[PDB]
Amino acid sequence: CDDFLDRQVPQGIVTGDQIASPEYVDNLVISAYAIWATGDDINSSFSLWNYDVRSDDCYKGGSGTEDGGVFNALEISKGINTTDWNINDIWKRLYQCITRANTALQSLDQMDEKTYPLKNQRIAEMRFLRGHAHFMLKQLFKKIVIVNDENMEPDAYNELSNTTYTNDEQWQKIADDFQFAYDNLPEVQIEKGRPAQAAAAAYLAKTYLYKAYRQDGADNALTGINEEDLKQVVKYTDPLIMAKGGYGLETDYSMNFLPQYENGAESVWAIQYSINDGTYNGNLNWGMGLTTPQILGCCDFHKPSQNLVNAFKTDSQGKPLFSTYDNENYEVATDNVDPRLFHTVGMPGFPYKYNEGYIIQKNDDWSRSKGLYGYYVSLKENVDPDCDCLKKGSYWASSLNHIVIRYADVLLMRAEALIQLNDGRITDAISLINEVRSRAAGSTMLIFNYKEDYGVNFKVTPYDLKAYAQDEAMKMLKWERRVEFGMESSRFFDLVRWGEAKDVINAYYVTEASRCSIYKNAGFTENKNEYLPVPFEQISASNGNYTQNFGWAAA
Amino acid sequence: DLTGAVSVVKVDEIQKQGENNPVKALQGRVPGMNITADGNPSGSATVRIRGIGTLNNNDPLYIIDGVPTKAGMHELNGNDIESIQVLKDAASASIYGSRAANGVIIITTKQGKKGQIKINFDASVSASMYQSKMNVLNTEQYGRAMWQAYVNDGENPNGNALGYAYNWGYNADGNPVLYGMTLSKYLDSKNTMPVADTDWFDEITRTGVIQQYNLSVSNGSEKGSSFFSLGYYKNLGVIKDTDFDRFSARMNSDYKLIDDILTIGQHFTLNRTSEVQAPGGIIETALDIPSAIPVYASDGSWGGPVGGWPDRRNPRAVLEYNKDNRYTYWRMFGDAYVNLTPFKGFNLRSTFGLDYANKQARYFTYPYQEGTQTNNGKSAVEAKQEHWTKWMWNAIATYQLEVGKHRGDVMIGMELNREDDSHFSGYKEDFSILTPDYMWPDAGSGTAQAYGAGEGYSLVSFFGKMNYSYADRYLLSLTLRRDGSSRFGKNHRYATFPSVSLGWRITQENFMKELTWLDDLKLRASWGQTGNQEISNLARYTIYAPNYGTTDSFGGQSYGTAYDITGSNGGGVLPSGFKRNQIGNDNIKWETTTQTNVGIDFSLFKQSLYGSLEYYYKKATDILTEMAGVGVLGEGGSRWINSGAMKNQGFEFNLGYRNKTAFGLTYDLNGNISTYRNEILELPETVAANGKFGGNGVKSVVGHTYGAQVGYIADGIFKSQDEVDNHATQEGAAVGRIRYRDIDHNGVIDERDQNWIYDPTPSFSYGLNIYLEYKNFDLTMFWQGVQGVDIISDVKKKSDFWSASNVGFLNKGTRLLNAWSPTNPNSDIPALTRSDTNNEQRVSTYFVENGSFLKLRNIQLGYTVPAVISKKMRMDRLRFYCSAQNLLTIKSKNFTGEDPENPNFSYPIPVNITFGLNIGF
Amino acid sequence: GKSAVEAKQEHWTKWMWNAIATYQLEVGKHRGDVMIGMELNREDDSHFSGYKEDFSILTPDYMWPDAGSGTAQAYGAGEGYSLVSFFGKMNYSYADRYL
Amino acid sequence: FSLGYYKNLGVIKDTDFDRFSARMNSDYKLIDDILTIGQHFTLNRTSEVQ
Ligand SMILES: OC[C@H]1O[C@@](CO)(OC[C@H]2O[C@@](CO)(OC[C@H]3O[C@@](CO)(OC[C@H]4O[C@@](CO[C@]5(CO)O[C@H](CO)[C@@H](O)[C@@H]5O)(OC[C@H]5O[C@@](CO)(OC[C@H]6O[C@](O)(CO)[C@@H](O)[C@@H]6O)[C@@H](O)[C@@H]5O)[C@@H](O)[C@@H]4O)[C@@H](O)[C@@H]3O)[C@@H](O)[C@@H]2O)[C@@H](O)[C@@H]1O
Ligand SMILES: OC[C@H]1O[C@@](CO)(OC[C@@]2(OC[C@H]3O[C@@](CO)(OC[C@H]4O[C@](O)(CO)[C@@H](O)[C@@H]4O)[C@@H](O)[C@@H]3O)O[C@H](CO)[C@@H](O)[C@@H]2O)[C@@H](O)[C@@H]1O
Ligand SMILES: CCCCCCCCOCCOCCOCCOCCO
């Protein structure tokens, strides 16, 4: 009657009430980091590479245009449906990362600081994570739901909206999270996966840098460049804050992308992939599992564009060929080139991740597209085939860390906000660009003998420190961001910050049709394609509380 | 029940299909009971009674000798079944248990008749043959379609970096024409993989062999009775390296002591089955892999794709690598009971049931390497164990009386149920010798994992049932239960389910006695409710799990809680934590299914024309739904809610004519037919946008049939540039491509132009059993039809397009050899392209087809040696026979595939041809 | 602070098969049983177990292998034997006094 | 047909044993007691903490 129907109880789980206990508070904290390693898959890498195929840096790759059709649609800007499974997917996954942050915060809020002295640094950690996801959702969808009430009941989520806040104050609610993190994180993290205070500053800065190019109108065009926001990017990339944490540029560019050199001075905050670690096949970067070349059987995604290749060409003084670069293919024998090309793009006749025993060819053995998507391979996320760090599960993946903020990003973001605040500090921003440009010109360890063996002519030089116009300085920063962050899945995100997407990409569609035939029918529709549509199922479940982005029909 | 909707199955028909699973031999025999099954050698099957009951679990409930069990039937010896009645309405179903909401099936096994001692040896052998096999390009045909695809798009077909070279030109009109075609001898430069014309379905199929033996023996004394059977099944399925078998023993017995007032009895069956199952997706892999890929590679390795050839595994090799993944399954099933009758009409009875199975298996991971299809060099083994232990206990008090013309049964009783499950497994990697003899966990040199967990539930039940008959012409019946389940909190533990049935034996009233031509007519109506509690044992709770992440994923998304917080890159245990799997719900209660039913039995022309009609309205309310979370709620936001409702109404008709003839031919027909509608009434907001039960996550299935689907309307093909420029704006539209309808008339073809295009519900289904006896010979046929059903074909994606697939260069159906072109303008098949520009992969009417069918399920022909000959060898009965199951299939001209009952990738349904015999002393 | 669990399983499956032929006679005072026959035996054993370390809640309800956060081990192996046997036995009694 | 139960809490604390038992035996004499079929079978579940 009664004792009989209570005896059996849940086996092998912690129940809802129990989870709040302090003995589990640090379990929840770790779990909220884990999901950045264990929550993405081959079509939703929290590096967001699958979506930077929209950029002029690269093509989606694969077997053909149907190998992830929804991402070809994204690549050519045509036949995107708000009902598409990827768009829903990434929306859903990123809000899942948010859950683990908030669940930990719900536990951490109730803790007593007298008896848990790190209470506020843990809380900061989680709020850093929460800002990470909201930031990326903001880049992806513009009109997002702000989920930052860790004590909110399940039912109250039903009455949320992606317009509770204006666009600018959506951006600010992200900034608030990374701000508290700055105020509270320690200067140094002996456990390197935990963000240090400089990381919180850098992401704080990045959030205001995206907030400052405002779109306060109803569509997506620029409505003016705010300089209270820009002045924050300066405040929070102050080199004095960065030195308190010991960050700086590695003496050679390639270190940011090499297993032996994880957690270096430039790695401001990275996702700590690992191997031999108790999990089925390892906490490898499965999200890049598609982008290994055919030398490993599969799958040849994330291939760089000839556009990006030619961008590393330099004139006879070691400066970008600003106007002419894409009018003739890079030719090894006769062109001056930036060393960063050989750290970004593996090209036929050249070594795959610095290994003379694997020379790339226009073959069955390297590319999968019979030429459709070209013959270039993405170098940054791949690793030496011999590497201890490389294992095959269902795909090939490594333990190479994904760095979310390289310290080069911090210098070039400072450079930017100075140049935009025309206020006399431009010759400083130029001197920041030369920090990166000079570092890059000397990054020829591991490719030192490419002159004699393959014939390449490395030539890169800093800009002379003159009093540059703001228009001319911008295009020099932009050009440094092209070569410095190629294939790191923020190129297209940059163009939508700059309001330049339709112009630069629709242009790319015609210049590159010649090389990659998929762009034949491609067309970017401005005030529409700068942001993915909010997912249809998401709007439809909201019962009118969610609002679709501009340019998309009432479905 | 004489008052409820009860289909009574003629068990003697069952053994004529040679089926292992008896439930599979009722396919089509009962109106309202749709039984589905692929051709796998278990004979496992799915039963749905009266539409689609609910949104969790629609499986029925068996009561075998008074013991409830919800699953198996292919695990027990079908051959020692005496009686089977199917109770379809709620009045008759409900008294049998708290798990009755999807109908109940009462099975009683054979006892021993009194003063009789019989024995029965039935035996059989069968060959099993692949029939409806899919037509799939061969190596030459592959090269023709490829040239067509290249040429249509206007690319140089000699640019196929496979082995083909083409001699082609232009005809007089200017359209392209292929003259000759040469193929390289090796698919790779290094000549490790020869070119073949492999027929892969022929390669992975075989002629199956079925065996069947059964002995049974019984004895009947005034004081007791006893029964004993032994049985064996063995079936090598038509897919190579898949097989099933079963050993069976059953002992039943009873004892009458004192004055037949203390009675003890026992039923018990013991079974050991074992199987190797077909891998996930071999049919699709066989469809997918090109003819040019050889079975064996130059060196005698397994053959595989190389060079430009697609990313598809060798299907023969898969089956071979999976041949030792055999499970062994021991199930013990039975009960013991005491019955006391302390005076006339009064009975006390208590039954203890036991249902206990355990399943053991090693699953082996061998290293593979078919061309570029590789496994690195991974080898592993997983030793897996599972136990399911269910027991049942009840006590029953019943009274009977007969007052002149009054009759009356009463019964009150109580029932307890409890299941406790456990399962665990040890996993080890890296073996030096790669055989099942070596590959035990003790002998691995690599990483280990351990898995497992338990769970369970309990049920309490209090019930009473009251039968009343007045003058053997008016019948009333009353059922009442209160039903608790451990799966709910105290505040909602129990629920109360009444039932009412009425019966009116028309003919036994005097004013009908003026009709010599109708022997019985009985109108019956019933109303009643049944609870449903069939949900996750953890349904109530908020679930956090440690999920360190020890478990195979696919492309990541393990969702584990371990993380290298330190940045060491691992080498040792990482810190971990917990992740939410489920949000709880304090106030889940019983789901309720309410059924109203009316029907009429009848018997005409002196018992020769018999049958019954049935009409029912069946509604499920407060439906227990695993409800997704709103997106922003995030990880494990789902919860079980009572939120949803669904109807099923329909008609069911049995009609059997029997009579002999004055030249020695008995003929006995009894057929049946039924139809139903199903409607989802309400549904949580997030399940409606979900698509989980319907319209593809674009429209809400509320108000449509369970599993109805929404899509684009395909309106033929653009046959002329004219027709594109005059159509709505349609991205990717061109000559040769599918024209999709502009439903909203907005001048653009976009995601809004979709509509209800698919309904899984037939107009009606029907079955028919013809039986003839003539000169010691006998002939049976059983026909089954389903009329008016939509199917969705995913083969059509592979048969009618060169690029309606994620991956270029897969093998394709044989229909696209007929694709539209200028050359060939009389075609429905879209012109061959190399890119799905037009996204003709979108759900659309193009894939909905008429899946109606009539099938000769069975035909059996027997000779029974006449008594005088056989009795003299001391044999009451000696009979030889021979039969064939699923011999013939009639289907729509508009169905483009092979089996309309199995249109895609399920285990093929073979044609069986059987010989066998019956000996009985 | 070690916590672990080991889920262990073992099966022992033995079966026997024989056929037996026997004759009896009673000649006045002679008696006599004869019997010849054959017997087959076979045992097949298996055993395996999954071992997991480190649990947050220390009760048998929690301590299942799925819920450990530490190192795992897997164990197990099989073995067996078979026997064949041919036999006969002859009884004789003379006058119920000599056997 | 028999059913049986044992249960014994040993004198050392936290050690116990129990057994559930069923047995069915039966035989059948057919033709002229010249064809005979029979069966013996026992089913047992024990459990112990040692
Ligand atoms: O129509 C959209 C529809 O699809 C769903 C469900 O599939 O997608 C959402 C969801 O799917 C995943 C993973 O399940 O991604 C699928 C998606 O990823 C893409 C790029 O977007 O890339 C896949 C690549 O992987 C390969 C690798 O295959 C490998 C190589 O190691 O070879 C064997 C044999 O294929 C595999 O076991 C190996 O992993 O393809 C995997 C992919 O291919 C499919 C096609 O059906 O499986 C092939 C299998 O089918 C068989 O014919 C029968 O079982 C067998 O031959 C074989 O096992 C698909 O099921 C697998 O996912 C390589 O081919 C590709 O280059 C796309 O190609 C692919 O569509 C998640 O990431 C994503 O979130 C739905 O939700 C949605 O409505
Ligand atoms: O507690 C386990 C839980 O899992 C299920 C399915 O979710 O079964 C587990 C498992 O068995 C499936 C195979 O075993 C056979 C052999 O008889 O059937 C077992 C019973 O399971 C049913 O499917 C439930 O109705 C029923 O058909 C059988 O009585 C085969 O027929 C099945 O193919 O499924 C896994 C494979 O997917 C395998 O590892 C497990 O053994 C539930 O049945 C069960 O409650
Ligand atoms: C002829 C078959 C009759 C079976 C009923 C008599 C029982 C014989 O052994 C079965 C024992 O199983 C009883 C249920 O298991 C009890 C376990 O509960 C305690 C641990 O959870």
Ligand SMILES: [Cl-]
């Ligand atoms: Cl709870």
Ligand SMILES: [Mg+2]
């Ligand atoms: Mg690492």
Ligand SMILES: [Mg+2]
């Ligand atoms: Mg329209």
